[PDB]
Write a protein that binds this ligand. Structure first.
Ligand SMILES: COC(=O)CN(C)S(=O)(=O)N1Cc2ccc(Cl)cc2[C@H](C(=O)Nc2cncc3ccccc23)C1
Ligand SMILES: COC(=O)CN(C)S(=O)(=O)N1Cc2ccc(Cl)cc2[C@H](C(=O)Nc2cncc3ccccc23)C1
Ligand SMILES: [Cl-]
Lengths: 297, 305
């Protein structure tokens, strides 16, 4: 029993964090094999600024050891610093681009040293509600599948509303954001419907069934209601993905949709679901199955 | 900006997790130097749990009855002893990944990270607190026994909890690393239940100060209170009594935000009376009590917004 916001074990990622300095800016880098990946803003016409830099300008620090930069190149908004030493702690890894609604673990770092780990989700507006202070740039987001680390996010900046923006590991931003000081803001956000449904199924698994009712709904009627509450539209793929949870608990996905419809129109009425007075949307259907089965890494 | 429930990086603890097997039972162990620490109930059957005589069960065991597995490598047990509710298995190999560590016993209201394991393999990490009733609201399934609770302030791991059992309400009970249980609990399948739980008042106050640091002051009022009048109100809402030590501990946060501890107590009194009225504080519709004053100073900026 118990349901918590759970992050992946961070150890395979801890062994990759380094500190990157160039002139006045100090931020974090990801050391994989003989290349260090970091945000290009550590150095705007980025190619004009980069052509003026020599390898010895970038000071790379791995623990107490200084690494020697032997080359440099830019890929989109990420800088790739070729170093003389291969990381002996390099894990089996991949660079993956995620979709909004998907979740991941964030290892927050300052000065190349990891300070904390938390779980979060890519919001439909392509921002993340993270916990970052100045010096956190270069912190990475990841998932683990058996022994392989899937790197999906690198932190670049904070928006005026306190939310965060960044790129995949190939330097492409999530969202209509750019890496410079300008007037930019997050768009209106929506609730991840498929995730709230998964979390209602997790509550049923943990013995919380007060919100269940005898009613069902059509997918079209549910989406007409959901659009009125700033909820993301629910697709047939979402319904198929919740299949296992629907068969395990005995509650059909459209049957659970009718419960969510009533929660949106009437509220919780002094009650909580899994210790929460709000409907939670940062657990995917796979996070629910993984936590209520015990998958190890 | 932002405020998340944040756990310590788990890597130093991952390198210590092993699998321990005794007959039909399999749970997790903590391998530090040449000793593996695990719950003593690994020697019990399900029947034994009603009234187990651990000393009688242990005297019948030899070193080769205990199978220890570190990854794909089998460790050889060369000795064994019991310290309270923990079993200490002397092994023939020191853990090369042993970090700088301490065994610390914590007080209720203290927070820590939990590395949940199954079969000596870590599956997840989450942050939690020792409740006033000495239980923890964790996320554990069968096979999680031996999972540990820890804090990593600076570069030293402070082990404070080892998981032993799930109580009937779904909450969890365990011991410090010296085998002494937190709470009036026993490693026995007895009629035992968690006492009535209360809210950690000093933690909710710290979290209200974190919200003020991040720019939210809607909940403040023009009133103050005496400590005695605050506690008379707090007791009525199942809140732990606030002591002079708690007031002293909130000093730094008070001086940083400019809000006196008894003035912040007045806002809490009002929040308990009125509720949130459709509003949230740091993305939460409930008053959060699993962030200590120390966690707030650690996670939040040194400059108020
Ligand atoms: C609060 O002000 C800002 O976030 C923006 N700034 C005015 S700044 O701090 O000077 N600024 C400019 C800027 C412009 C573009 C890019 Cl790609 C990055 C950056 C930086 C940035 O975003 N760094 C931060 C990241 N995460 C978290 C933060 C928390 C606090 C303060 C900087 C944080 C710095
Ligand atoms: C509803 O809870 C249960 O089913 C727990 N039990 C009644 S049990 O599984 O029969 N049980 C009794 C027992 C009594 C004392 C001690 Cl020290 C240990 C143990 C064991 C125990 O507690 N192991 C578990 C630990 N954490 C989490 C769990 C989750 C699920 C299932 C076992 C979990 C086994
Ligand atoms: Cl303590």
């Amino acid at each position: 029993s118990g349901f918590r916001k759970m992050a992946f074990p961070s150890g395979k990622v801890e062994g990759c964090m380094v500190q990157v300095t160039c002139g006045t800016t100090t931020l974090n880098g990801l050391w994989l094999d003989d290349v260090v990946y970091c945000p290009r803003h550590v150095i705007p016409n980025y190619e004009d600024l980069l052509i003026r830099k020599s390898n010895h300008n970038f000071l790379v620090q791995a623990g107490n050891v200084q690494l020697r930069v032997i080359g440099h190149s830019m890929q989109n908004c990420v800088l790739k610093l070729k170093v003389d030493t291969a990381n002996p702690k390099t894990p089996k890894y991949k660079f993956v681009r995620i979709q909004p609604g998907q979740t991941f673990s964030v290892l927050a770092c300052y000065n190349g040293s990891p300070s904390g780990v938390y779980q979060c989700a890519m919001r439909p507006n392509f921002t993340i509600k993270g916990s970052f202070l100045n010096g956190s740039c270069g912190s990475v987001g990841f998932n683990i599948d058996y022994d392989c680390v899937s790197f999906c996010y690198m932190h670049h900046m904070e928006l005026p509303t306190g939310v965060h923006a960044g790129t995949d590991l190939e330097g492409n931003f999530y969202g209509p954001f750019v890496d410079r000081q300008t007037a930019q803001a997050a768009g209106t956000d929506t609730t991840i419907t498929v995730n709230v449904l998964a979390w209602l199924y997790a509550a049923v698994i943990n013995g919380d069934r007060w919100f269940l009712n005898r009613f069902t709904t059509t997918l079209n009627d549910f989406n007409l209601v959901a659009m009125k509450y700033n909820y993301e539209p629910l697709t047939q793929d979402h319904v198929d993905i919740l299949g296992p949870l629907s068969a395990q608990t005995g509650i059909a996905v459209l049957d659970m949709c009718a419960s969510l419809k009533e929660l949106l129109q009437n509220g919780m009425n002094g009650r909580t679901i899994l210790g929460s007075a709000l409907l939670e949307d940062e657990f995917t259907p796979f996070d629910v199955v993984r936590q209520c089965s015990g998958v190890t890494f």
